[PDB]
């Protein structure tokens, strides 16, 4: 009943379509909830979509100024794999935090509600607050807006605490049945860690970061699920992944610390290993968050200063605009697949014909066989759009 | 939208025949009763002829009764009026009109009527 | 048969009372076989009311109906320049028969 | 567990009311999916309905001018039978071509979306995307826009890719729990073949398509589930089928080849065989898309030069407007019976009082006892709705 | 698993509230189904509504004119007991008329839909097309418009075909998993039956129907299940129940003929049998469907010249508009509880204020404790409510 990952990484050689939801285009006519920071989640039956929820449609006169990510009415939304965020959405929690896994029995939630100053992590396992933690650092508790992973019963989830840019506490957090058994504190060569991308890299778990404050290479957190020991390097590859990065050609990475280049801020996003080769995905402008492109660099996790792509995708076209991204993982026949979703954000702040912002998802999971070309856009068109 | 249009009416010596035709559009004759109607130059309006969405003639009025024949072609949406042996008394405007019968309250009423048609027995 | 007397052959009054026209009955009637219709000249009739109190789709509040048995009246509370015309009572139900009628005049 | 569609065909001497949508009815007043190409599958409890949606509603702003059949946008949408496509609908995969089976386990999806020229099929089996293929011809990789056949876990796709007028590559996959296990090229006498009704006609599977090219007989491709065999051939009677076609008086087939008679274009429609004899439905019409009506030509199956029906059916009336119409079995108690369904398509190109193009479904299944006469048309009233 | 509803009658005082749907007050604000001719039915588990829609919403263009009750748009809809019949109800076949039986196993549906002179009856049955008829009398086919009735696995369905004033011909078809194993033209003292509300009294079922022709009592239908024997009566009781009626004062029975009493048209309505005593229910006008009251008749199931009343309740006021009502049996632990509906119809044809017809419906189910008073109209004000 319990899942434990234990297959191998099945063979990946590209991303094929999987998944769109097209809730702004819905919007425009209907009662959607007006989302932001998404990610996808699959029990062992099927796959769903989860979001925060800003606790309003977006038709609606309570859409105005929704750019802030803290307010007491946001809430964390779970439908099906496609389902659009309608009316009917069961909202699981308070939340302007959140992370979601399953243990192959039941949903374990962890949902950051509260003040600023001192904020409440609550941790429901199977329709039942079974925890509940405070702030340690008294500033923003924050975790990692994707999939936490469960291996053997034992979920594994990282929580942020302090300054965005300076020393902030790190913790691991590992839960049985909503119960929290143990806390181990970050330790290893990543100085900044945020809004983690975990997958199960059998026996353990491996999260790739942000690093919001010196860095635009990305942090790694290994976790042993079993022994609660914890390891951090950064990602190795010499095309970095974070936004604002340097241009490809100025770029560089260290494999243990921060490279110290357009470091201030990030955005979430994913990266993972086949055999030396790394993974990854980023947005197509280097500095905002504009396209989303997916490829592979040879060597890239274990050797900095290596620049050679393959196997180069384009989900989002560079015109069009992109948000956080992350990783989940599907137990396959006979391997665990990798997949990745995109957030594609509109609205204020960046297009200022309208009041709100909210975002659209698009689902991307790996192949062994052969693909083409496209683009998949959100396509909204909000000059149009009530505003 | 609905609309009903007669053709046919003419001049007919007496002891003569016309045909008239009410064309339907909009709706099917396989759900709705349809009438024959005329108002003589001078008098009021005369139910002439009904015929059931089933197909069945339930009435003709006494004086058409035997020479007139009213029938349907349920493929081209049409309704038919055969006269036969015109009289100077059958000079008149004819109308097609349309109403319902209702499982639970039974007929409704003619709601919906043709423009109409001239039929003048001369001489 | 149910010979229908509609009573008034002619009504002449001015634009803004009361009408009141009367069906007559040979004999009782089913109360909701009974309709009224409204022929302008040049224009093909209109159905107003339907199974003696009930009006049509479109018709305008003025014109409203009452009867039961062999009494039947339909009145335009406030008259119209439009509303004069001749006005019809059927008998849709067996025995099948119209009225003769009666005319509004402007005066 | 499997679905072997081992039992006999129920006999058949009419199609008799099944269901009904009334999709642009409700429209008017309500928030409802603007779809296109739609077809009817069952799995061994129920039916569902699948259409792809242009990823908007209609009284949207974006249902302005949703002609196209080729955007980012268009979803699959998957609801039970009955249920209209409201904001409820469960969008299954990016597509904007399909094709869906039930082998009686877990539902298969075949969907293509992407670039013209490079075109990528995704292969979702049980909620996992298990394979991917990219376009072999370089064009418009397309399927059948109905349901595929799985007979012991195994299930066809036919899939073009090519020129509309011209030879074109045409593949028959054969998938194993979505992954795609052989792959038989066409071949036979069959010259255009797209859009294909595809049935079980144990022990294998018979497809009744499109000729696109020079015909307005319909191709016919025998695929043989166990030997990975094909056979093409064409409908041999002598009322052919496709719109546009010429007038019944002066028509004719070749049993084997195209008729070369007004086969320009076409239209997605449906045949099958009772004995010697052809059940088969077509448009009123023979120009436009417009009626749609069903009977049997004796001795069709087996003679061109056989114009002699019988048990004619008027599923929509002349004057009209109808669509793709497509097959699909439901194992009975003791046979297999066959329904079909009728896409009515409203909207412009060629109603030009709105700006948008949707379609609504009737569904007939076919019967052993009496039926009577009727008409079921769309409904929809054009100029009172918005535009 | 078959449903042979061999337990007793449950005690009966009285008649206390289930259920009511408010479907036209919510119809003000939101989008819900034209309906009329409603009914309830249960399976082993919970009840469900049905009701024949006219393929529109009520904030609708298409809402015009929607008193007709035979259009090509009808639709059966099924939902929950209570759950309002939003845009997400399924609509499970073509009809203008339709019943609807459960038993043990899986639902029964039949479905009568297309021309008045050829009309056609299909038999649903676990989401199959399992049977079909056509129209004897080549008139308009029609059936109960409320629950029918399996006993052992074989159903019970009555359907009329003819005039509505004069002979028809009446037949009662055993069916069988969907199957019509049986046909038995209805034979006995009762003329002209119509629009049954039939209940298991085991081991047989008793209808009680109208008299759309010369009788202003219910006429009765035992159908023995099993020898396929029809047994026809009219209600014993001096209170008849049909609408026109004359009178309490003035009114007859006869118990085996029609009275000859107001009886030129009628409503669907029920009775039942407690003993000799009669539980019956009817409008509270005598002329007009307004309000509606039930009561027991002593004596009144086998004795006409009995007025005597009691155990009144007044579910409707006697100002309020009242419809359709019907009967359906629920198995408790011990015992068989009968339950009414009553349909409360509003708009056109009665109500001149707007241009559509709707109804709402209120459930009570017969209870052996005690009960109070009260009144539950429908409760819209078409007023206010748009046109
Ligand atoms: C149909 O779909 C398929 C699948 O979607 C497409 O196939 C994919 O096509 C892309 C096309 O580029 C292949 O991407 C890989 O890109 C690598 C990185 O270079 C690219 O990105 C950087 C950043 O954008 C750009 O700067 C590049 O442009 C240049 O700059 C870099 C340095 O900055 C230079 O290195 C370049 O030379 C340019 O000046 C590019 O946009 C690229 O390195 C990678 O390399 C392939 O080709 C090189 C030779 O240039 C080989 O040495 C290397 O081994 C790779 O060759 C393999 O792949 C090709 C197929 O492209 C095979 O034919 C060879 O046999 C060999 O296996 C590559 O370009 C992506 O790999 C590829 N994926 C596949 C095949 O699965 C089709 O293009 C698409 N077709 C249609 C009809 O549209
Ligand atoms: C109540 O409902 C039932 C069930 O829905 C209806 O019964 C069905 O009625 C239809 C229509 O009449 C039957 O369809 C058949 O039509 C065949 C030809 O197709 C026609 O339509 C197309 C398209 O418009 C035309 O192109 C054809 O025209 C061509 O040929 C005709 C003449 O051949 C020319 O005039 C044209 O110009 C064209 O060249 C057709 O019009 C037809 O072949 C088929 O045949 C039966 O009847 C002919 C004699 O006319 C016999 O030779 C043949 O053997 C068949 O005879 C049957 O009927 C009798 C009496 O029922 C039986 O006793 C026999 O056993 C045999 O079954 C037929 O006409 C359809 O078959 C029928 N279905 C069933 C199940 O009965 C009722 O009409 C309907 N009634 C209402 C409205 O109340
Ligand atoms: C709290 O709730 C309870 C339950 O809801 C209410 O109790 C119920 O009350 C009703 C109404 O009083 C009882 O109804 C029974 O009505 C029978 C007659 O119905 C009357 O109304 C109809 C319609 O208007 C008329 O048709 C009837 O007939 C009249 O006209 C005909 C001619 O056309 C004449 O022939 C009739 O005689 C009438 O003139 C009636 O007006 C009635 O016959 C029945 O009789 C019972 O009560 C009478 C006295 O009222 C007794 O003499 C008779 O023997 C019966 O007595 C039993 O019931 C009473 C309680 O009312 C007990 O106290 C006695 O001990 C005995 O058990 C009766 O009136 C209905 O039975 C009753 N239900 C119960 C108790 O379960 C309460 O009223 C309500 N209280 C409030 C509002 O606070
Ligand atoms: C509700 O339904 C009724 C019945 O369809 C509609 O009434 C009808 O409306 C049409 C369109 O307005 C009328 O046609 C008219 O023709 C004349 C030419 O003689 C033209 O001048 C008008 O502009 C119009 O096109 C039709 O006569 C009228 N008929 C009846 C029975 O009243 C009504 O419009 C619908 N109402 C609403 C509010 O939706
Ligand atoms: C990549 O970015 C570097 C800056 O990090 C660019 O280098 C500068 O470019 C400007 C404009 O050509 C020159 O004036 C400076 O002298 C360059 N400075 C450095 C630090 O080299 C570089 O040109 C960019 N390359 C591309 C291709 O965009
Ligand atoms: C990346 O996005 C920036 C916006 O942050 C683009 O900068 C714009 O460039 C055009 C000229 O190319 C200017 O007219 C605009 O004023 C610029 N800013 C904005 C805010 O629009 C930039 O071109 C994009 N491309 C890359 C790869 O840097
Ligand atoms: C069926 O179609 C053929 C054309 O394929 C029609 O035949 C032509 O019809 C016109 C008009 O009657 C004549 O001027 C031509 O001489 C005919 N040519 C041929 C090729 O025969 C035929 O009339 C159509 N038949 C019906 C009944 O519509
Ligand atoms: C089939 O559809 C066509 C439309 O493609 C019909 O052609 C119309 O015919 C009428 C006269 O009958 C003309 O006034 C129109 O101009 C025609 N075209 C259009 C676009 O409306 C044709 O009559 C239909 N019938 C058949 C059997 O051919
Ligand atoms: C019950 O109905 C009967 C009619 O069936 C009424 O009896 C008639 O009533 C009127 C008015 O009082 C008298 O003019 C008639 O002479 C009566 N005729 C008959 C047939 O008796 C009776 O009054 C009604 N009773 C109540 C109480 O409403
Ligand atoms: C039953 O309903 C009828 C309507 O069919 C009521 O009759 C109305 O009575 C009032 C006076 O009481 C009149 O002003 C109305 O003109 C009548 N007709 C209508 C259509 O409203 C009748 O009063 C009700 N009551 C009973 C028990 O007969
Ligand atoms: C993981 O679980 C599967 C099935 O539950 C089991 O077959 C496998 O042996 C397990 N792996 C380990 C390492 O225990
Ligand atoms: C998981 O459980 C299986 C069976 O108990 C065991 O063999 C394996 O060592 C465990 N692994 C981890 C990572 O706890
Ligand atoms: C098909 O499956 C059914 C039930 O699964 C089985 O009874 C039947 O024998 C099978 N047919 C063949 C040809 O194996
Ligand atoms: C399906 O499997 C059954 C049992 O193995 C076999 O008898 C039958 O021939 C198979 N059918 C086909 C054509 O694959
Ligand atoms: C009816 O069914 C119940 C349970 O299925 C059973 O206990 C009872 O004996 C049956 N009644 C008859 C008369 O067979
Ligand atoms: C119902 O079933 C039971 C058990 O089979 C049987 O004893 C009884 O006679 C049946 N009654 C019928 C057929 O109504
Ligand atoms: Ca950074
Ligand atoms: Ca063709
Ligand atoms: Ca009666």
């Known amino acids: 009943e319990y899942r434990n990952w234990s297959k191998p990484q099945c063979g990946i050689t590209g991303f094929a379509p999987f998944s769109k939801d097209n809730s702004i285009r819905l919007s425009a006519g209907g009662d959607i909830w007006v989302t932001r920071e998404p990610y996808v989640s699959c029990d062992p039956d099927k796959c769903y979509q989860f979001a925060l929820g800003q606790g309003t449609t977006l038709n609606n006169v309570h859409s105005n100024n929704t750019v802030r990510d803290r307010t007491p009415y946001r809430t964390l939304l779970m439908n099906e794999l496609g389902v659009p965020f309608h009316l009917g959405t069961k909202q699981v929690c308070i939340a302007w935090s959140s992370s979601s896994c399953h243990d192959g029995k039941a949903w374990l939630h962890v949902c950051i509600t509260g003040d600023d100053k001192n904020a409440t992590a609550s941790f429901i396992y199977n329709g039942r607050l079974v925890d509940s933690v405070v702030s340690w650092s008294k500033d923003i508790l924050r975790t990692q807006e994707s999939e936490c992973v469960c291996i053997n019963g034992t979920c594994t989830v990282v929580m942020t605490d302090g300054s965005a840019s300076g020393k902030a506490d790190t913790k691991i957090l590992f839960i049985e049945e909503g119960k929290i058994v143990h806390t181990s504190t970050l330790s290893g060569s990543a100085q900044h860690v945020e809004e983690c991308s975990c997958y199960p890299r059998y026996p353990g778990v491996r999260c790739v970061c942000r690093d919001n404050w010196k860095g635009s290479n990305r942090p790694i957190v290994d976790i042993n699920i079993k022994d609660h020991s914890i390891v951090s390097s950064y990602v190795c590859s010499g095309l970095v992944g974070d936004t604002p990065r340097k241009n490809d050609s100025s770029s560089s990475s260290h494999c243990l610390d921060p490279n110290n280049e357009e470091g201030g801020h990030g955005v979430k996003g994913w990266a993972f290993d086949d055999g030396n080769d790394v993974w990854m995905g980023r947005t197509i402008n280097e500095t905002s968050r504009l396209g989303y492109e997916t490829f592979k660099v040879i060597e890239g996790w274990s050797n900095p200063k290596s620049k050679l792509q393959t196997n180069r995708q384009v989900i989002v076209d560079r015109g069009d605009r992109s948000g956080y991204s992350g990783i989940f993982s599907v137990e396959g026949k006979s391997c665990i697949n990798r997949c990745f979703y995109v957030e594609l954000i509109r609205g204020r702040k960046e297009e200022t014909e309208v009041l709100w912002t909210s975002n659209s998802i698009v689902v991307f999971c790996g192949t062994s066989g052969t693909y083409g070309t496209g683009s998949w856009p959100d396509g909204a068109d909000l000059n149009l759009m009530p505003i | 939208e609905v609309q009903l249009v007669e053709s046919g009416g003419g001049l007919v010596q007496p002891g003569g025949s016309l045909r008239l035709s009410c064309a339907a559009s909009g709706f099917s004759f396989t759900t709705y009763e349809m009438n024959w109607v005329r108002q003589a130059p001078g008098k009021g309006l005369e139910w002439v002829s009904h015929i059931s969405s089933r197909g069945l003639v339930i009435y003709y009025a006494d004086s058409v009764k035997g020479r007139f024949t009213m029938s349907r072609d349920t493929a081209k949406n049409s309704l038919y009026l055969q006269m036969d042996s015109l009289t100077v008394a059958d000079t008149a405007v004819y109308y097609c009109a349309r109403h319902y019968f209702d499982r639970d309250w039974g007929y409704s009423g003619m709601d919906l009527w043709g423009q109409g048609t001239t039929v003048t027995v001369s001489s | 048969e149910v010979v229908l007397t509609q009573s008034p052959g002619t009504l002449s009054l001015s634009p803004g009372e009361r009408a009141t026209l009367s069906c007559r009955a040979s004999?009782?009637?089913?109360?909701?076989?009974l309709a009224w219709y409204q022929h302008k000249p040049g224009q093909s009739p209109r159905l107003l009311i339907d199974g003696a109190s009930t009006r049509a789709i479109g018709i305008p509040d003025r014109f409203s109906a009452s009867g039961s048995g062999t009494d039947f009246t339909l009145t335009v509370s406030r008259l119209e320049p439009e509303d004069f015309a001749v006005y019809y009572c059927?008998?849709?139900?067996?025995?099948?028969?119209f009225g003769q009628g009666t005319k509004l005049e402007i005066k | 567990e499997y679905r072997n569609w081992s039992k006999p065909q129920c006999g058949i001497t009419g199609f008799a009311p099944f269901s009904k949508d009334n999709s642009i009815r409700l429209s008017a007043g309500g928030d409802i999916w603007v779809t296109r190409e739609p077809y009817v599958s069952c799995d061994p409890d129920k039916c569902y309905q699948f259409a792809l949606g242009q990823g908007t509603t209609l009284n949207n702003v974006h249902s302005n001018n949703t002609v196209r059949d080729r955007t980012p946008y268009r979803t699959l949408l998957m609801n039970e039978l009955g249920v209209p496509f409201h904001l409820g609908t469960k969008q299954v995969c990016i597509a904007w071509s399909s094709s869906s089976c039930h082998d009686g386990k877990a539902w298969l999806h075949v969907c293509i979306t992407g670039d013209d020229k490079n075109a990528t099929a995704s292969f979702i089996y049980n909620g996992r995307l298990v394979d991917s293929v990219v376009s072999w011809s370089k064009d418009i990789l397309r399927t059948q826009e109905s349901e595929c056949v799985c007979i012991n876990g195994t299930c066809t796709v036919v899939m073009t890719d090519g020129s509309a007028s011209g030879k074109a590559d045409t593949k028959i996959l054969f998938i194993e729990e979505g992954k795609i296990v052989h792959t038989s090229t066409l071949s036979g006498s069959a010259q255009h073949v797209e859009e294909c009704s595809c049935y079980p006609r144990y022990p294998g599977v018979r497809c009744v398509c499109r000729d696109n090219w020079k015909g307005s007989n319909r191709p016919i491709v025998d695929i043989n589930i166990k030997d990975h065999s094909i056979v093409s051939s064409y409908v041999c009677s002598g009322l052919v089928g496709d719109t546009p076609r010429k007038n019944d008086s002066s028509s004719s087939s070749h049993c084997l080849d195209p008729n070369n008679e007004e086969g320009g274009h076409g239209v997605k429609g449906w045949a099958f065989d009772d004995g010697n004899d052809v059940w088969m439905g077509r448009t009123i019409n023979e120009t436009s898309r417009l009626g749609y009506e069903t009977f049997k030509v004796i001795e069709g199956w087996s003679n061109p030069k056989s114009k002699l029906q019988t048990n004619r059916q008027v599923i929509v009336d002349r004057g009209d407007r109808s669509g793709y119409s497509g097959i699909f079995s439901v194992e009975g108690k003791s046979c297999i019976n066959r329904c079909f369904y009728v896409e009515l398509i409203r909207g412009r190109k060629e109603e030009t009082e709105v700006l948008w193009t949707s379609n609504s479904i009737v569904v007939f299944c076919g019967t052993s006892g009496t039926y009577g006469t009727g008409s079921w048309p769309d409904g929809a009233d054009l100029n009172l709705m918005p535009i | 698993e078959y449903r042979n509803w061999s337990k007793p009658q449950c005690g009966i005082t009285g008649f206390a509230p289930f259920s009511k749907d408010n479907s036209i007050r919510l119809s003000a604000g939101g989008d819900i189904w034209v309906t009329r001719e409603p009914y309830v039915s249960c399976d082993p588990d919970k009840c469900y509504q049905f009701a024949l829609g006219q393929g529109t919403t009520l904030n609708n263009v298409h809402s015009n004119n929607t008193v007709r009750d035979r259009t090509p748009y009808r639709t059966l809809l099924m939902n929950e007991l209570g759950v309002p019949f939003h845009l997400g109800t399924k609509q499970v076949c073509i009809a203008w008329s339709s019943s609807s039986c459960h038993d043990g196993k899986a639902w029964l549906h039949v479905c009568i839909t297309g021309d008045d002179k050829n009309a056609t009856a299909s038999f649903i049955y676990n989401g199959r097309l399992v049977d079909s008829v056509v129209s004897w009398s080549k008139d308009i086919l029609r059936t109960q418009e409320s629950e029918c009735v399996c006993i052992n696995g074989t159903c019970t369905v009555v359907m009329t075909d003819g005039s509505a004033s004069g002979k028809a011909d009446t037949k009662i078809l055993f069916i069988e998993e969907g199957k019509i194993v049986h046909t038995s033209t209805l034979s006995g003292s009762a003329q002209h039956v119509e629009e049954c509300s039939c209940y298991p009294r085991y081991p047989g079922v008793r209808c009680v129907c109208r008299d759309n022709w010369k009788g202003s009592n219910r006429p009765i239908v035992d159908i023995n299940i099993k020898d396929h024997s029809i047994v026809s009566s009219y209600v014993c009781s001096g209170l008849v129940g049909d609408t026109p009626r004359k009178n309490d004062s003035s009114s007859s029975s006869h118990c085996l003929d029609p009275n000859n009493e107001e009886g030129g048209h009628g409503v669907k309505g029920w009775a039942f049998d407690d003993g000799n005593d009669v539980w019956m229910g009817r409008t509270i006008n005598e002329t007009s469907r307004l309000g509606y009251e039930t009561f027991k008749v002593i004596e009144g199931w086998s004795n006409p010249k009995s007025k005597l009343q009691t155990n009144r309740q007044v579910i409707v006021d006697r100002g309020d508009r009242s419809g359709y009502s019907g009967i359906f049996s629920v198995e408790g632990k011990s015992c068989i509880n009968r339950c009414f509906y009553v349909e409360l119809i509003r708009g056109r044809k009665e109500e001149t204020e707007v241009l559509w017809t709707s109804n709402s419906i209120v459930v009570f189910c017969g209870t052996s404790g005690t009960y109070g008073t009260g009144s539950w109209p429908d409760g819209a004000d078409l007023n206010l409510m748009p046109i």
């Open positions: 004999q009782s009637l089913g109360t909701n076989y």
């Open positions: 059927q008998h849709y139900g067996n025995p099948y028969t």
